[PDB]
């Protein structure tokens, strides 16, 4: 369920990337759209080091 | 006299090889058997945040899985945060993850590292000391509500030292604490225990201020393993029934006689006796109750074999003396004897000022406060000069011994064949225990070093023996077979 | 998801989707790395910074020198320490575990194992710049297990040492960097070796005269040449030293006459805010003031 987290960006450093989490998530309802969406949305690679892809990545496993 | 005296060469030969085979036995059982001795795990205490939620009740902390606290990944994220120091709690699980502890872990043993940072305007003070504020908690199932175990004040004074030289360009890196002694008890009882530790702070009054800068908690939980218990009770199942035999057997032995026991004969049965006490396996109770006595209680039996052993020794060499000598009371032995109920109760006293004080308060520690220190080291150190004396003793009345062997030697052939016979016996029955427990005593010398050297584990073939837990096994099959041919060999034996 | 990731292997992606919660420590403790080596190299004229993508292991250097040796090396020892310590923290719950048994095996162990081959799996190729990378990373790890504390209590018959236990903590990372920058001022230089029937290089052998040995395996090993690090050139990665500030002193690489390759330097009156003077507690939220006098920092043309 993409919807569910929605949480993960508020980890995040940017209010961009938090308006690009809202955007998608409320618009977009398939996953490869989604993550290429957010990457087109606040300009960086998927990084294990980022906090929202961090907790993405953790909450995909629950 | 014994029977030691009248066996040939060959039964004696073929006792020594049984004995040998049970040696060997009893050594390759912790060798291959057991897994070792004991594990040590590191914990890196999660640091919860109190968002003052604490305001009277006792909240608690858990570091992982449902209902996990307020982490904080890094210490410096708290000023941010206006986080202050009162509201981070450090706190573990003492079982690591899908985990479960079991009451043959026969104990717990805590201790701390403290991972203390390096800052010109913060360093550690000349004689600082953190005050910490430990609550500790135990669980039986992962649905239950944690219950209090202990809630304490934990003082411990700082030993840290810093290697690089105290610049700006160094700041950040650690200093090189000591472990601090944290907590034991001698029950694991319960299956999950959660540890919730505060540093509460209090400038004006001096408690937890100038200790430095810690980041990070760790902390290492020590243990009996499992198997290793396992082994052990298995070993004194059947270790128990045979000195019980030999217990029986002798003791109808030594009264079946036309005369009364001499002091020798019940000096070996006194030896028995602790080292059947040594044998009965009561810690196969600690596994259905929660008795935290356990190891005051193991202390106190190794601590009444080593005396009796310690006391048999000098017996024997006082009893076989050959002049002027031979007088089967225990009174004429108080020089010799003395030194060891001395050493032993100073040592006695300091166990139960250690290990006894801590059944009310688990994470007291004797050396906490100086003067404490003064009466451990004091009580320690009187021992070490009653060894030191009885070692002494020990030595002396040895070689007086052999000088009135000597001197005996030369008039064997002028006395009768009784006396010649008798005196012959005395002379190989001293020679032949002297022999056996200068072995045994060399032997378990040596392999206490190798045990203390080692790895811990040496690899040979498609199996790896276990060092220490062979040590453990082997040497205490060695000293139960030791007592065995004692007891077996200098009973009396009949005439006919 | 994570198969767009920059800079994974094909079989580093499988384990990837295999365990999702590894990645995230692994990527932590490179990035502990990069800022380790970041953090060593502050002063130097190579911040440990090149002109390329960032990736979970950093922007590649495109010249098997020092640099690259050290970055690998300290790469490799991050993850590795990043994974015993996410272990030894309950962040990973199927590391290690035999619980009641043996007491469960050892944690370095499994960090050591894990770590070695995910890390060795981004050497998708072969080429004398693989077998380099392939022993920097080695040396890493076997300077990482170097590194290890050992400490022993006895909890015995009273106190005494008849039963004492032992075990192995890892060291704070920044001792590692120290030790890792130590070997770095000392890396060996190397060509590899070929011959008619492999076809294809196995190993690698001293360049260096007086020797014909294989280098040690904690020895930091480099096959190319450092270039100036202060020109910006694509070609070999360097960023240049362009706008890098400098102490505008005497010692070595940190005055402006070093840092700059003789440009000289510009300044400005930046005016530090420099809070100090507080009334420090042992961590967290303390109330002082600032004192910022005045700051003209130099920085390089
Ligand atoms: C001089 C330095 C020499 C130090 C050597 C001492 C090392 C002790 C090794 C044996 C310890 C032992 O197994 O205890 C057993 C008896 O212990 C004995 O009966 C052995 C008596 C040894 C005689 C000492 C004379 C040495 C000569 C000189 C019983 O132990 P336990 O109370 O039943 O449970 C504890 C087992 N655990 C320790 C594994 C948890």
Redesign the pocket.
């Known amino acids: 369920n993409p919807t569910d987290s929605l949480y993960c960006c508020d980890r995040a450093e940017d209010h961009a990337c938090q308006n690009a989490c809202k955007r998608i998530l409320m618009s977009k309802k398939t996953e490869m759209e989604i993550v290429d969406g957010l990457i087109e949305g606040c300009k960086t690679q998927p990084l294990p080091q980022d906090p929202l892809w961090q907790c993405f990545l953790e909450s995909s496993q629950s | 006299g014994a029977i030691i005296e009248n066996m040939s060469t060959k039964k004696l030969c073929i006792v020594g090889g049984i004995l040998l085979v049970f040696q060997i036995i009893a050594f390759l059982v912790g060798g291959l058997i057991a897994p070792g001795?004991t594990t040590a795990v590191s914990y890196m205490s999660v640091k919860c945040v109190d968002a003052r939620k604490n305001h009277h009740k006792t909240k608690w902390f858990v570091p992982w899985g449902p209902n996990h606290c307020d982490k904080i990944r890094d210490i410096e994220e708290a000023i941010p945060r206006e986080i202050e120091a009162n509201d981070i709690v450090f706190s573990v699980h003492i079982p690591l993850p899908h985990m479960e502890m079991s009451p043959w872990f026969?104990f717990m043993l805590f201790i701390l590292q403290l991972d203390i940072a390096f800052k010109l305007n913060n360093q550690i003070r000349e004689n600082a000391e953190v005050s910490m504020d430990v609550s500790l908690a135990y669980r039986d199932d992962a649905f239950a509500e944690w219950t209090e175990m202990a809630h304490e004040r934990v003082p411990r004074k700082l030993k840290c030292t810093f290697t690089s030289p105290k610049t700006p360009e160094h700041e950040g890196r650690y200093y090189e604490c000591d472990v601090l002694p944290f907590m034991e008890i001698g029950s694991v009882a319960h299956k999950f225990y959660l540890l919730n530790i505060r540093l509460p702070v209090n400038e004006k009054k001096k408690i937890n201020v100038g200790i430095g800068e810690i980041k990070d908690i760790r902390l290492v939980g020590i243990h009996?393993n499992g198997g290793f218990t396992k082994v052990?009770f298995a070993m004194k199942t059947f270790l128990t029934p045979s000195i019980f035999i030999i217990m029986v057997w002798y003791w109808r032995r030594i009264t079946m006689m036309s005369r009364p026991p001499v002091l020798l004969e019940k000096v070996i049965f006194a030896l028995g006796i602790s080292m059947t006490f040594?044998n009965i396996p009561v810690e196969w109770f600690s596994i259905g109750f929660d008795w935290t006595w356990m190891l005051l209680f193991?202390d106190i039996?190794?601590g009444i074999?080593?005396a009796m052993?310690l006391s048999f020794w000098i017996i024997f060499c006082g009893e076989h003396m050959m002049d002027q000598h031979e007088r089967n009371h225990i009174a004429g032995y108080w020089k010799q004897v003395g030194p060891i109920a001395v050493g032993s109760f100073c040592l006695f006293i300091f166990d139960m000022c250690e290990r006894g004080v801590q059944l009310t308060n688990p994470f007291y520690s004797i050396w906490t406060t100086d003067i404490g220190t003064e009466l451990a080291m004091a009580f320690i150190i009187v021992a070490g000069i009653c060894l030191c004396l009885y070692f002494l003793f020990l030595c002396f009345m040895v070689f007086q011994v052999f000088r009135n062997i000597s001197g005996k030697q030369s008039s064997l052939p002028a006395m009768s064949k009784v006396r010649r016979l008798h005196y012959e016996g005395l002379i190989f029955r001293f020679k032949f225990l002297m022999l056996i427990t200068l072995a045994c005593?060399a032997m378990?010398?040596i392999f206490?070093i190798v045990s203390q050297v080692t790895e811990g584990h040496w690899k040979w073939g498609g199996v790896t023996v276990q060092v220490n837990s062979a040590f453990?096994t082997g040497?205490?099959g060695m000293?139960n077979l030791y007592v065995f041919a004692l007891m077996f060999l200098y009973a009396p034996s009949h005439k006919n | 998801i994570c198969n767009k990731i920059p800079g994974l292997a094909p079989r580093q992606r499988a384990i990837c989707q295999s365990r999702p919660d590894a990645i995230i420590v692994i990527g932590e403790g490179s990035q502990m790395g990069l800022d380790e080596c970041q953090f060593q190299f502050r002063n130097g004229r190579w911040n440990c910074s090149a002109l390329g993508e960032r990736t979970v292991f950093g922007k590649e250097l495109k010249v098997g020198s020092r640099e690259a040796a050290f970055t690998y090396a300290i790469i490799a020892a991050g993850v590795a320490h990043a994974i015993t310590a996410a272990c030894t923290q309950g962040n990973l719950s199927d590391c290690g575990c035999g619980w009641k048994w043996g007491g469960c095996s050892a944690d370095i162990r499994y960090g050591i194992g894990f770590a070695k081959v995910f890390v060795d799996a981004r050497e998708i190729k072969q080429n004398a710049r693989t077998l380099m990378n392939l022993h920097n990373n080695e040396a890493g790890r076997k300077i990482l297990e170097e590194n290890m504390k050992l400490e022993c209590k006895c909890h015995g018959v009273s106190g005494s040492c008849?039963?004492k236990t032992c075990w192995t903590t890892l060291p704070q990372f920044r001792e590692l960097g120290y030790v890792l920058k130590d070997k770095y001022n000392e890396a060996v230089h190397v060509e590899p070796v070929r011959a008619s029937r492999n076809k294809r290089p196995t190993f690698l052998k001293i360049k260096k005269p007086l020797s014909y040995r294989k280098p040690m395996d904690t020895d930091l090993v480099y096959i190319e040449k450092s270039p100036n690090y202060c020109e910006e050139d694509p070609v070999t990665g360097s960023v240049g030293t362009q706008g890098r500030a400098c102490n505008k002193t005497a010692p070595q690489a940190s005055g402006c006459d070093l840092m700059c390759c003789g440009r000289g330097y510009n300044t400005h009156q930046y005016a530090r805010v420099w809070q100090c003077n507080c009334k420090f507690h042992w961590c967290c939220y303390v109330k002082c003031n600032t004192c910022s006098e005045r700051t003209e920092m130099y920085t390089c043309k």
């Open positions: 001795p026969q009996q052990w040594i193991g039996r190794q074999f080593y052993l005593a378990t010398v206490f453990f040497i205490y000293w | 008849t039963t």
